[PDB]
Amino acid sequence: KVFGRCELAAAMKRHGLDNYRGYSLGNWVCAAKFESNFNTQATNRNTDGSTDYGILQINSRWWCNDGRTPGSRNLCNIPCSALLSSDITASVNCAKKIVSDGNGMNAWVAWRNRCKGTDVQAWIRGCRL
Ligand code: NA
């Protein structure tokens, strides 16, 4: 599923991401824009053999099982395919664990490089929230 900007903002707010660990909803929408272009089915293979999955490009090295990332963990206790669903529940629940990990949203390269320090509220501007 490819979400609209305001459609994703509404879904993330319903699932409790607005101000989760102090990160405003615009931070999460900005991260999803630059990680996946709002596409739940996005996948990207990394140099280390791990893969990034879904709207927030969550990595198989630590967070999910994809059956082909040797010596990796599954800290969200999910198959990586769960992160590709039209329903963002699994991605949101796993993102909450990731952002609690120590480096906050710096865990998302696209957030650090393209969202951090910018007018992230622009990403929810005009939305009926
Ligand atoms: Na894994």
From Swiss-Prot:
EC number(s) per entry: 3.2.1.17
- Fetch the CDD domains from UniProt: LYZ_C (cd16897)
The C-type lysozyme domain is annotated at 1-129
One GO term in the molecular function aspect is: beta-N-acetylglucosaminidase activity
Disulfide-linked positions = 6-127, 30-115, 64-80, 76-94
| Catalytic reactions on record | Hydrolysis of (1->4)-beta-linkages between N-acetylmuramic acid and N-acetyl-D-glucosamine residues in a peptidoglycan and between N-acetyl-D-glucosamine residues in chitodextrins
Among its keywords, does the record have Secreted?
Answer: yes
Where is it located? Secreted
Primary site of residence = secreted
Single GO biological process annotation from the record: killing of cells of another organism
Which keywords does this Swiss-Prot/TrEMBL entry list? Answer: Allergen, Antimicrobial, Bacteriolytic enzyme, Disulfide bond, Glycosidase, Hydrolase, Secreted, Signal
Q: Which residues form a coiled coil?
A: none
- Which SUPFAM superfamilies does the entry mention? Lysozyme-like (SSF53955)
The record makes one more remark, namely:
Lysozyme C is capable of both hydrolysis and transglycosylation; it also shows a slight esterase activity. It acts rapidly on both peptide-substituted and unsubstituted peptidoglycan, and slowly on chitin oligosaccharides.
Its subunit composition reads: Monomer.
- Name the family: Belongs to the glycosyl hydrolase 22 family.
Q: What is this protein called?
A: Lysozyme C
Species name: Gallus gallus (Chicken)
